């Protein structure tokens, strides 16, 4: 009952909920950051700083392995290799598919590490859930229509979309074992940046910062020399 | 349109009402005791029969109100 | 979270009392009427509580033939 | 193509409406034998027995009513032949009134003959 | 039963906002109307002009009960449009009894069946329809002046809400608004009609007014002038609702503005219930002896209306290019025939009136079904006409123009022949059922000396046959402006259907195209039965015609 | 009262006013 | 209240033009044959 954190439970900071998967998310965020730095020259201290901080924090998250991870990762390889078509972003899109009312998943690569991001259909009460949660694209086009309008309607989706109950050529992806609420505290004692949900948001802002640094080229020589007298104040001659 | 309808419907209305539109009539009233043993108020006289003798009108009335309560809300409800 | 009545009626009636009391207790009070109509009258007559006779609201005309009364005739006036 | 719990909901409504429709069907079948609008040979004889029993018992044919004599009339005039409208508006008689549309003389005319034979049979004993 | 069905359906509707429930709430309403049929069938074992019910307020007649049952069947047939999906997927691999009862077919049906269409998402739609039926049936049974007014309102208000239940359509809100306003004017005439009756006669009983009327038929202070011209005002309020001329102007606009599945029920049920109610009034108010009262009969409005409905209905329909405006003018010419049979009050004309009303209600329903089905068939078809691109609310009225039907006999021939037979039956061509209906009303009128109205009607029909033939000329004589959709039939895009058995185990997977997409059976069977009834009426006329012979004998006997 | 339960059930007597959790689980397979 | 295409006279005038019924004067069609030379 009290073994695991409950995703979306309030953390004590308003608007900050319990992360459904904090460990993998930090690895995804850290490996993604260690990938974007590579478009920065090695003599940049900004690169070396972020590269140093992220690797230091990465080795700590690896140090806290969930129970049964080795067993699940051996299974989950045999799923991705046998049914790579199902989880291929180039085939099912970056969002895992088009049917949000069933399970979806793609395989993502960062630094060469392999990630599988899954979108379990949103948990809502039975009595306010229409058509299992299907997406309402509105009424089908009826009457006299031109071909283009029928094209714009979504007519190519009859031949690609799936009845969710049609599951024979597919395998149900079981996700990664999670960290028991004791391990979450133990990991965040090592990192020392507050709750793991706080650590995650600082990591993802750290990921977005790299793109701004790269564009600005913050490691190149000073743009504007201050002109004479620019930083003079009211100092008395020593 | 005013005169033609009014002329036509003036005959449709009865003597009871068209009265009092140099020899006038005077209505005369007296008293009875057998019909005064328990005089009811008109609200009670209607209650004496609105729920037994004419209860079909009440049941139909209720259906009209129900359709208005359901219909007037079905067409104006916030869609969510 | 919220229970469903048809899955677990008793857990629903507890939830309805605690979380939606004005609506749930409207149904209890209102239902208590037809329970009153079905139980109080039989037990009242059981214990000798007798419904009273209707009070007269029109002159009670006696049935049967007229009684052929002698007395109080015109001669007695003087 | 309904969601996960919609058909069970629809069964509960269909279940009720068939129960309600089938009870009106069962009530309508018996009352027509009382209305004289169906073959009712069995009902007539068990009517003549029940009622002529009530006569010799001295108890009211149709029983006693808490309601006033005029209220009984309104009840009789609201429900007589009223199972012919069951398709539209249902209605059942729960009032013990004496206004049932039939001459009651046959029941009295009958019981006394059962009272005549009972006394004669007691004489030879 | 209808009242228990409304209350029960309303309690289930009031604890859900799930729009996916609309299809199942419509399927339960058809079950409910079938119980009402079983109950009014049991009530049919008595011979009587009428039996007062519920304190004199309501009455039951053999004619009252045969008409409630007809309303119930018609309602079951119209309720099918919102109870089953328009289209279907059919393969020979799924076509046996074991297949239908013990196998399942999985495929993406959301677009093919229009699961999320507007007709499939209004939760309260069957409920508002049941209220209109509740009002319709109560009116046939009304025996009091006050009962009449409440029943016509309960029928009318629901037709206003049905005309407005598509709330996101500017065309339905407008049609709903016109109908509510002008029908409210219509009801103020009906209330004035009843009010003058009770004020001059002291009674709300129709049974009491008929008695006062029969005494007053002899051959000095209170001549009963009020009955004929109170009934006249009362009658005009009902000629608005049946859309008899010259009170017809609203119906072409409203019927054309509201959606077509809705215009099916709104253009058919009010007529059956209102005409049956007027029939008993016309029989019990006819002065057999010629008299001063006869000179002023309220029924001359009906002849004036029937006269006008014949000219107006056929002539204004000549230059109608909109199919719903054409169908409504065709109705105004058919209610002229109905009115003419209702105004000649005789055994032969009452048989004719009863036969015509039932046959026209099944025929006008066939016309609506074919129209609705034709615009659901155009799903695998494409057009390049600017006019068909400039139409408004194409989802609610898929077919709006006669020209949209150009070449339909080359797209689907039997559905085009079904509409040809139905239209030819509106014309009055033998040996179809509509000819026999028209002939029965002409025979009655000719017998009773209405030779002039018979001549109007025959000349009127040839005029109305002109625009009926322009519809058929559109179906048969030109080529389709619609083309098979090029991508739905491309031999490269096919959806996967998969056939499972009784317990979630796959049997066979199939790949299917657009040629495997057909009309759903409930509509093709319904069109098939009514077409064949119309076609083969001459071999199956005995029980239907005798049913009307006996009802008239009960009404005119004793 | 049934029509009143209809008005309470559909939230017809409700004025909406104010001024839903994560559903993306990432998984780590490690190296290729 | 209803759209012009649905109830408008000019839209009927398109579908049934008055020019579909020729009317010539004797100055141009003396022989009643459409101006045949
Ligand atoms: C929802 C739940 C409904 C619960 C109903 C109330 C609880 C039952 C009360 C009870 O036990 O009464 C038994 C009691 C038995 O008396 P008894 O001493 O054992 O035998 C003597 C005889 O019955 C004959 O006795 P009597 O001749 O001396 O007197 C006649 C009778 C006079 O009583 C009557 O005449 C009442 C019957 C009305 C006519 C039938 C109407 C049914 C048609 C329904 C229409 C649906 C429209 C759609 O007097 C009474 O017995 C008093 C009964 C108690 C007061 C009457 C109130 C009961 C009706 C409550 C209506 C509830 C409306 C709910 C809303 C429904 C619509 C949304 O009386 C009844 O049988 C009443 C039956 C009511 C059924 C009609 C309602 C359906
Ligand atoms: C049962 C109690 C219940 O369900 O309450 C929970 C219900 C919500 O529970 P839920 O978990 O959301 O229901 C599951 C689904 O919604 C699915 O819920 P559901 O639709 O299956 O059940 C709703 C329930 C609602 O109806 C009732 O509960 C009947 C009382 O029953 C129905 O609507 C289907 C049968 C309707 C029978 C109609 C009988 C009415 C008398 C008609 C004239 C008779 C002569 O809330 C209610 O209050 C429904 C009861 C209606 C209360 C109105 C009382 C005033 C009476 C006037
Ligand atoms: C006057 C004429 C009087 C009659 C003279 C004879 C002419 C009629 C012959 C019979 C035709 C209808 C019956 C056959 C039929 O429906 O077969 C359809 C169909 C054959 O077509 P299909 O296209 O091959 O079907 C495969 C498609 O995938 C199917 O896909 P789907 O999704 O499209 O299927 C939908 C299906 C789904 O529906 C169902 O599931 C059927 C439910 C049946 C319920 C049965 C209740 C029984 C108790 C009722 C109450 C007591 C009576 O619905 C239907 O097929 C029903 C269509 C009903 C059309 C309207 C017929 C009634 C109205 C007549 C109009 C009259 C107008 C003129 C007169 C106006 C008034 C005077 O066969 C079946 O569905 C098999 C089952 C047949 C019925 C059940 C039998 C076994 C029961 C268990 C043991
Ligand atoms: C598609 C074209 C061809 C159609 C031909 C059929 C038309 C004629 C049918 C006439 C019809 C149906 C009414 C349907 C109305 C539908 C709408 C209008 C007609 C539209 C076409 C009405 O029958 C009525 O007919 C009237 C005149 O004909 C009589 O007047 C009535 O007395 C008579 O009841 C026949 O119904 C029949 O049902 C049967 C039980 O199934 C009844 O038998 C009995 O009923 C119970 C004891 O009562 C018992 O429980 C049952 O065991 C017993 O057997 C009959 O007694 C009769 O009621
Ligand atoms: C067509 C006229 C309706 C009809 O079929 O009547 C027969 C039936 C008559 O049924 P029924 O009353 O004869 O049922 C059998 C009764 N015993 C066993 C005693 C003979 O009408 C109905 O009641 C069918 C109800 C559903 C109607 C829905 C339309 C389909
Ligand atoms: C046991 C019988 C049931 C008693 C009612 C229980 C209750 O309080 O439920 C009220 C009901 C809650 O429905 P809901 O909005 O779905 O609740 C949140 C979860 N979705 O609220 C509803 O939406 C149902 C509609 C209102 C029902 C209340 C009926 C009160 C009417 C007066 C009755 C007295 C006469």
Determine contact: A23 vs chain F, CB below 8 A: yes
Q: What are the backbone dihedrals phi and psi of residue B31, each rounded to the nearest 5 degrees, phi first?
A: -125, 150
The set of residues, in sequence order, having a beta carbon less than 8 Å from that of G11 and lying 6+ positions away, is: E321, G4, G5
Residues 6 or more apart whose CB falls under 8 angstroms from that of E391 comprise: A143, A144, E397, E400, E401, G5
**DSSP E strand boundaries for chain F:** 25-30
Probe residue for ligand 2, chosen from C1, C2, C6, C29 as the CB with the greatest number of ligand atoms within 8 Å: C6
Asked if the C-beta of E85 comes within 8 angstroms of chain A's C-beta atoms, the answer is: no
Q: Whose CA is nearest to atom 11 of ligand 3?
A: E525
Closest of E337, E311, E326, E412 to residue E368, by C-alpha: E326
E72/E1 Cα distance (integer angstroms)? 12
Buried b (16+ CB within 10 A) or exposed e, A21-49: bbbbbbbbbbbbbbbbbeebeeebeebee
**E173 Cβ contact list (under 8 Å, min separation 6):** E164, E167
Q: Tell me, what DSSP letter sits at residue B39?
A: P
SS3 E217: coil
Residue nearest to atom 54 of ligand 1 (CA): C37
Helix E347-377 / helix E433-447 crossing angle, nearest 10 deg: 150
Which bin fits A126, alpha (ψ -120 to 50), beta or left (φ > 0)?
Answer: alpha
Q: Helices then strands (H, E): number in chain G? A: 2, 0
Say how far apart CA C15 and CA C2 lie, in whole Å: 7
Beta bridge partners of A45: none
Asked if the Cβ–Cβ distance from B38 to C57 is below 8 Å, we say yes
Straight-line distance from the first to the last Cα atom of chain E, in angstroms, rounded to the nearest whole number? 33
Strand partners, E500: E104, E506
**Is A144 within 8 Å of chain E by CB?**
yes
Ligand 4, atom nearest to E45 Cα: 48
Residue pairs spanning A and E at CB distance below 8 A: 110
Entry field: residues in chain B: 80
- Cα A109 to Cα A21, A90, A97: the distances in Å are 18, 13, 18
The CB density around residue D49, as the number of other CB atoms within 10 Å, is: 12
Q: Does E147 touch chain B (CB under 8 A)?
A: yes
Whether E157 and B71 have beta carbons less than 8 Å apart is answered as yes
CB of E105 sitting under 6 A from ligand 3: no
- D94: Cβ–Cβ under 8 A, 6 or more apart, which residues? none
Give the resolution to one decimal, in Å: 2.8
Pairing of strands F25-30, A113-118: antiparallel
Determine whether the interchain pair E319/G12 forms a contact, defined as Cβ–Cβ distance below 8 Å: yes
Q: Which residue of A has its CA nearest to D5?
A: A126
DSSP C74: G
For residue E293, say if its preceding peptide bond is cis, omega within 30 degrees of 0: no
Strand partners, D1: none
* Chain centroid offset of residue C37 CA: 6
**Domain boundary assignment for chain C:** 1-78
- Within 13 Å of residue A196, how many CA atoms lie on the same side as its CB? 28
**Burial profile D81-92: b = 16 or more Cβ within 10 angstroms, e = fewer:** bbbbbbbbbbee
- D106 lies within 8 A of chain E by CB: no
Token code pair at residue C1: 């979270």
A148 CB burial (10 A radius; 0-12, 13-18, 19+): exposed
Which amino acid residue places its CA nearest to atom 24 of ligand 5?
E38
CB-based contacts of E120: which residues, under 8 Å, 6+ apart? E22, E23, E82, E85, E114
Using the beta-carbon criterion (under 8 Å), do E111 and A155 form an inter-chain contact?
A: yes
Instruction: Determine the distance from the C-alpha atom of residue D49 to the mean position of all C-alpha atoms in its chain, rounded to a whole number.
Output: 15
Backbone dihedral region for residue C66 (phi beyond 0: left; psi -120 to 50: alpha; all else: beta): beta
CA D93 to ligand 1 centroid distance, Å: 9
The CB-based long-range contact list for E449-456 (8 Å cut-off, 24+ gap) reads E450/E340, E450/E344, E453/E303, E453/E306, E453/E307, E453/E340, E456/E307, E456/E310, E456/E311
Yes or no: say if E509 and E496 are a contact pair by the CB < 8 Å rule: yes
Q: Would you tell me how many other CB atoms lie within 10 Å of the CB of residue E178?
A: 20
Ligand 3, residue E94: give the atom nearest the CA. Answer: 28
Q: Contacts from D15-22 at CB under 8 Å and sequence distance 24+?
A: D16/E8, D17/E4, D17/E5, D17/E8, D17/E9, D17/E28, D17/E31, D17/E32, D17/E35, D18/E31, D18/E35, D20/E1, D20/E4, D20/E8, D20/E35, D21/E1, D21/E4, D21/E32, D21/E35, D21/E38, D21/E39, D22/E35
φ, ψ at E381 (rounded to 5°): -125, 150
Chain A touched by F30 (CB under 8 Å): yes
Phi-psi region of A194 (alpha: psi -120 to 50; beta: other; left: phi over 0): left
Could you give the CA distance from residue E545 to residue D14 in angstroms, rounded to a whole number? 36
Tell me the residue length of chain C.
78
The token pair at D93 is 């008689």
Which of E82, E355, E525 is the best mutation target for the ligand 3 pocket, counting ligand atoms within 8 Å of the beta carbon and taking the most? E525
Of the residues A102, A121, A126, the best mutation for testing chain D's interface (the one with the most D CB atoms within 10 Å of its CB) is A126
Q: What is the dihedral of CA E516, E521, E524, E530, to 10 degrees?
A: 170
**D37–E46 CB contact, under 8 Å:** yes
Q: Which residues of C touch B41 (CB under 8 A)?
A: none
Question: Is the Cβ pair F16, B69 closer than 8 Å?
Answer: no
Q: Which residue of C has its CA nearest to D66?
A: C51
DSSP letter for A219, please. Answer: T
Shortest distance, CA E259 to any CA of chain G (angstroms): 14
Residue closest by Cα to atom 27 of ligand 6: F5
Instruction: For residue F8, give the H/E element and its range.
Output: helix F2-9
| Ligand located closest to E71 CA | 4
Q: How far is CA A109 from the centre of its chain?
A: 12
Closest CB from A80, A112, A117 relative to F31:
A112
For residue F31, list chain A residues with Cβ-Cβ distance below 8 A: 112-114
**Block residue for tokens 């020392």:** A192
Burial status of residue A68 (CB atoms within 10 A of its CB: 0-12, 13-18, 19 or more)? exposed
Helix ranges restricted to H, chain A: 22-36, 45-62, 69-82, 89-92, 147-153, 181-191, 196-216
Eight-state DSSP code of residue B52: T
E526 and E369 Cβ atoms separated by less than 8 Å: yes
Q: Report in angstroms the alpha-carbon separations of E275 from B54, E110, E189, E279.
A: 26, 43, 17, 6
Cβ atoms within 10 Å of D62's Cβ, excluding its own: 17
Query: Which position has the token pair 């409800």?
Result: B77
Residues E160, E183 contacting (CB under 8 angstroms): yes
Could you tell me if E465 and E427 are in contact, meaning their C-beta atoms sit under 8 angstroms apart?
Answer: yes
- Contact between A164 and A102 (Cβ < 8 Å): yes
Q: What angle do CA A177, A1, A59 make, to 5 degrees?
A: 35
Of E11, E16, E17, the CB nearest to F2: E11
Contact E255, E329 (CB under 8 A): no
* Closest in A145, A157, A158 to E382, CB measured: A145
Cα-trace Rg, chain D: 22
Question: Of E5, E161, E151, which Cα lies nearest the Cα of E72?
Answer: E5
DSSP conformational letter for A140: P
The helix, strand and coil proportions of chain B, stated in percent and rounded to the nearest 5, come to 60, 0, 40
Using a CB cutoff of 8 Å and minimum separation of 24, what contacts does A8-13 make? A8/F21, A8/F22, A11/A195, A11/A197, A12/A195, A13/A195, A13/A197, A13/A198
Tokens in use for D27?
Answer: 């009530």
| Whether E332 contacts E243, CB under 8 Å | yes
Query: A113-118 and E51-53: which strand pairing?
Result: unpaired
Are the beta carbons of E265 and E78 closer than 8 angstroms? yes
The DSSP-derived string for C58-71 is S--PPPSS-----S
Determine the Cα–Cα distance for residues E310 and E329; give it in Å rounded to an integer: 10
Which token pair is E132?
A: 């209109």
F2 inside 8 A of chain E by CB = yes
d(CA C38, CA E183): 46
Q: What is the DSSP string of chain D?
A: ---SSHHHHHHHHHHHHHHHHHHHHHHHHHHHHHHTSS--HHHHHHHHHHHHHHHHTT--TT---SS-HHHHHHHHHHHTTGGGSTTT---------S--SS-SHHHHHHHHHHHHHHHHHHHT-
Alpha carbon A223 to its chain's center: 36
8-state DSSP, E142: B
Q: Where does chain A break, by residue before each gap (C–N > 2.5 Å)?
A: none
Whether E115 and E85 have beta carbons less than 8 Å apart is answered as yes
Tokens of E93: 């691999």
Method for this entry: cryo-EM
- Interface check for A126 against chain D (CB to CB < 8 A): the answer is yes
Are E91 and E512 in contact by the 8 Å Cβ rule? The answer is yes
| Nearest-by-CA chain A residue for D2 | A131
C27 CB near ligand 6 (under 6 Å): yes
**Is the Cβ–Cβ distance between F30 and A73 less than 8 Å?**
yes
- Identify which of E409, E377, E370, E405 has the alpha carbon closest to the alpha carbon of residue E518: E377
Q: How far apart are CA A199 and CA A180, in angstroms?
A: 18
Chains D and G touch (3+ CB pairs under 8 A): no
Question: In degrees rounded to 5, what are phi and psi of residue D18?
Answer: -75, -40
State how far the Cα of C25 lies from the Cα of A145, in Å rounded to an integer: 56
DSSP string covering E481-534: SEEE-TTTTSSS--EEEEEE-TTS-EEEEEEE-GGGEEE-HHHHHHHHHHHHHH
D49 reaches C (C-beta below 8 A): no
Write down the residue that tokens 């094209």 correspond to. Answer: A151
Beta-carbon contacts of E457 under 8 Å, excluding residues fewer than 6 positions away, are: E310, E336, E337, E340, E438, E441, E442, E445
Is the separation of the CB atoms in E175 and E160 below 8 Å? no
Q: What angle do CA A55, A58, A62 make, to 5 degrees?
A: 140
Sheet holding E506-512, edge to edge: E104-106, E495-500, E506-512
Residue for token digits 């007539």? D44
Q: Which residues of B touch F15 (CB under 8 A)?
A: none
CA dihedral for E230, E232, E233, E237, sign (positive or negative)? positive
C-alpha dist (Å) from residue E527 to A220, E108, E119, E266, E412: 80, 28, 20, 19, 14
């Amino acid at each position: 009952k009290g073994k695991f954190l409950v995703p979306g439970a309030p953390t004590g900071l308003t608007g900050l909920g319990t992360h459904p998967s904090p460990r993998s998310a930090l690895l995804y965020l850290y490996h993604s950051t260690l990938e974007k730095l590579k478009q920065i020259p090695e003599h940049s201290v900004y690169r070396q700083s972020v590269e140093a901080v992220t690797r230091h924090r990465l080795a700590l998250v690896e140090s806290v392995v969930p129970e049964g991870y080795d067993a699940w990762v051996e299974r989950a390889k045999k799923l991705l290799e046998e049914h790579a078509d199902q989880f291929d972003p180039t085939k099912v899109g970056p969002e895992g598919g088009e049917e949000v009312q069933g399970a979806r998943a793609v395989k993502v690569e960062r630094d060469g590490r392999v990630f599988v991001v899954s979108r379990l259909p949103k948990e809502e009460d039975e009595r306010v859930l229409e058509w299992d949660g299907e997406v309402d694209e509105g009424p089908e086009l009826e009457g006299s229509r031109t071909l283009e309008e029928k094209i714009e309607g979504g007519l190519e989706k009859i031949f690609t979309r799936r009845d969710v109950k049609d599951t024979v050529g597919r395998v149900e992806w079981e996700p990664e074992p999670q960290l028991t609420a004791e391990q979450v505290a133990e990991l965040e004692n090592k990192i020392g940046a507050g709750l793991i949900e706080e650590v995650i948001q600082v990591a993802e802002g750290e990921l977005k910062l790299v793109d701004t640094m790269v564009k600005a080229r913050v490691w190149e020589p000073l743009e504007e020399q201050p002109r004479p007298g620019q930083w003079e104040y009211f100092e008395r001659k020593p | 349109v005013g005169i033609i309808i009014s002329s036509f419907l003036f005959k449709m209305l009865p003597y009871g009402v068209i009265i009092s539109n140099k020899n006038d009539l005077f209505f005369i009233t007296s008293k009875i005791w057998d019909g005064a043993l328990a005089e009811n108020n008109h609200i009670s006289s209607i209650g004496n029969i609105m729920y037994t003798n004419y209860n079909v009108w009440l049941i139909l009335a209720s259906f009209i109100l129900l359709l208005a309560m359901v219909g007037a809300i079905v067409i104006t409800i916030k869609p969510r | 979270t919220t229970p469903r009545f048809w899955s677990t009626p008793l857990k629903y009636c507890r939830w309805a009392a605690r979380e939606r009391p004005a609506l749930f207790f409207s149904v209890v009070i209102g239902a208590l009427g037809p329970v009153t109509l079905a139980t109080v009258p039989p037990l009242r007559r059981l214990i000798g509580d007798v419904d009273a006779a209707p009070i007269p609201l029109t002159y009670p005309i006696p049935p049967g033939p007229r009684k052929q009364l002698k007395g109080y005739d015109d001669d007695t006036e003087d | 193509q309904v969601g996960r719990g919609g058909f069970a909901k629809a069964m509960r409504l269909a279940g009720f409406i068939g129960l309600a429709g089938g009870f009106l069907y069962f009530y309508q079948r018996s009352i027509l034998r009382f209305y004289g609008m169906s073959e009712n040979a069995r009902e007539v004889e068990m009517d003549m027995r029940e009622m002529t029993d009530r006569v010799k018992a001295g108890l009211p044919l149709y029983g006693e009513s808490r309601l006033s004599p005029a209220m009984q009339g309104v009840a009789a005039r609201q429900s007589r032949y009223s199972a012919l409208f069951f398709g539209v508006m249902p209605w059942f008689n729960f009032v013990n009134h004496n206004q049932h549309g039939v001459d009651t003389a046959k029941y009295y005319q009958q019981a006394e003959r059962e009272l005549e034979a009972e006394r004669l049979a007691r004489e030879q004993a | 039963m209808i009242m228990i069905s409304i209350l029960s359906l309303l309690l289930s509707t009031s604890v859900t906002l799930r729009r996916d429930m609309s299809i199942l709430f419509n399927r339960i309403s058809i079950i409910a109307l079938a119980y009402c049929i079983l109950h009014d069938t049991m009530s049919l074992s008595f011979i009587s002009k009428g039996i007062g019910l519920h304190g004199g307020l309501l009455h039951i007649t053999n004619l009252t009960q045969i008409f409630h049952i007809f309303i119930f069947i018609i309602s079951i047939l119209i309720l099918q449009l919102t109870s089953f999906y328009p289209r279907k997927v059919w393969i020979p691999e799924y076509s046996s009894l074991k297949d239908i009862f013990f196998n399942k077919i999985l495929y993406y049906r959301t677009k093919i069946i229009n699961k999320m269409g507007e007709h499939m998402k209004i939760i309260e739609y069957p409920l508002i329809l049941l209220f209109v039926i509740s009002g319709a049936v109560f009116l046939i049974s009304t025996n009091d002046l006050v009962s009449i007014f409440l029943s016509i309102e309960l029928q009318s208000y629901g037709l206003y809400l049905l005309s407005t239940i598509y709330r996101n359509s500017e065309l339905s809100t407008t049609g709903g608004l016109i109908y509510f306003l002008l029908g409210g004017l219509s009801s103020c005439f009906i209330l004035l009609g009843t009010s003058l009756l009770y004020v001059n006669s002291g009674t709300t009983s129709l049974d009491g007014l008929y008695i006062l009327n029969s005494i007053s038929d002899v051959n000095s202070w209170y001549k009963p002038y009020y009955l004929n011209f109170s009934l006249l005002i009362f009658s005009i309020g009902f000629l608005f609702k049946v859309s008899a001329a010259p009170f017809h102007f609203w119906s072409p606009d409203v019927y054309d503005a509201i959606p077509t599945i809705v215009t099916t029920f709104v253009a058919i049920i009010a007529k059956i219930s209102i005409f049956i109610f007027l029939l008993e009034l016309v029989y019990y108010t006819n002065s057999n002896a010629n008299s001063y009262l006869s000179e002023f009969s309220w029924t001359y409005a009906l002849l004036i209306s029937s006269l006008l409905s014949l000219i107006i209905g056929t002539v204004v329909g000549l230059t109608q290019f909109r199919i719903k405006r054409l169908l409504a003018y065709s109705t105004i010419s058919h209610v002229g025939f109905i009115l003419l049979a209702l105004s000649v009050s005789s055994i032969e004309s009452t048989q004719a009136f009863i036969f015509y009303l039932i046959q026209y209600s099944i025929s006008n329903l066939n016309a609506f079904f074919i129209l609705i089905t034709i615009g659901f068939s155009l799903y695998g078809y494409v057009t390049n006409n600017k006019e068909y691109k400039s139409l408004l609310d194409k989802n609610n009225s898929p077919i709006q123009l006669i020209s949209q039907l150009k070449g339909y006999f080359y797209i689907n021939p039997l559905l085009s022949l079904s509409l040809a037979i139905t239209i030819f039956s509106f014309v009055g061509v033998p040996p179809l059922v509509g000819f026999f209906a028209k002939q029965m009303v002409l025979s009655a009128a000719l017998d009773n000396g209405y030779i002039f109205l018979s001549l109007i009607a025959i000349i009127t029909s040839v005029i109305g046959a002109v625009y009926y033939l322009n519809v058929i000329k559109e179906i048969f004589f030109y080529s389709p402006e619609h083309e098979v959709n090029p991508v739905l039939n491309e031999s490269d895009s096919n959806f996967s259907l998969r056939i499972l058995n009784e317990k979630n185990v796959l049997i066979r997977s199939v790949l299917l195209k657009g040629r495997n997409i057909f009309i759903s059976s409930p509509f093709s069977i319904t069109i098939s039965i009514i077409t064949n009834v119309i076609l083969l009426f001459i071999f199956m006329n005995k029980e239907w015609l005798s049913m009307g012979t006996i009802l008239v004998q009960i009404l005119f006997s004793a | 009262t049934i029509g009143f339960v209809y008005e309470l059930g559909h939230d017809a007597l409700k004025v909406h006013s104010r001024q839903l959790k994560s559903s993306v689980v990432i998984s780590y397979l490690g190296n290729i | 209240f209803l759209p012009e295409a649905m109830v408008g006279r000019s839209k009927i005038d398109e579908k049934y033009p008055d020019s579909d019924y020729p009317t010539l004067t004797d100055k141009e069609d003396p022989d009643m044959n459409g101006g045949y030379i």
